[PDB]
Amino acid sequence: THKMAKRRIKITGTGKVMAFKSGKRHQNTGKSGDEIRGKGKGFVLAKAEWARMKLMLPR
Amino acid sequence: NGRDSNPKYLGVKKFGGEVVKAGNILVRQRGTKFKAGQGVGMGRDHTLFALSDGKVVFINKGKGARFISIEAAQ
């Protein structure tokens, strides 16, 4: 899907998922301190395969 | 009633003799069972942790007050 090219799986030099954090951003929040300020990166070594098979070609 | 339940966890994570690192979590608990010794800090949830490198050390003074220290190698 084209909603994948704009999904947090960028084709990095190596070939893994360039994730982020889905804890809480837009709604349902207001507690904790810097829980929302967790707008960093994320990575996984068990789904890189069944995710890159949809965006690999159009890197 | 059958309804209701909870996975829970807790326990000990770094046992005595082990070589910790700056940030390793030592023991998880609810209250203050294991008090922060020398070389060992304490989180909101009484979760013990290590400040630097070293070795895990248990100390018991007849129950009641538990202590965990870290003896550096070097």
Binding site: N28, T29, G30, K31 | -
Partner: protein
Amino acid sequence: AKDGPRIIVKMESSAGTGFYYTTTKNRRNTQAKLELKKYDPVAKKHVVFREKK
């Protein structure tokens, strides 16, 4: 985190010049009017900071 007419509310944060939110759970239960404080926004800091919407 329900949201109805019930007492207490989620509050926006303003500032003297500063344009920053703190997000705080207040309550109209007791003293409910002086929602002013001091939260330095990215800036020089020390800015008069009232969450009072």
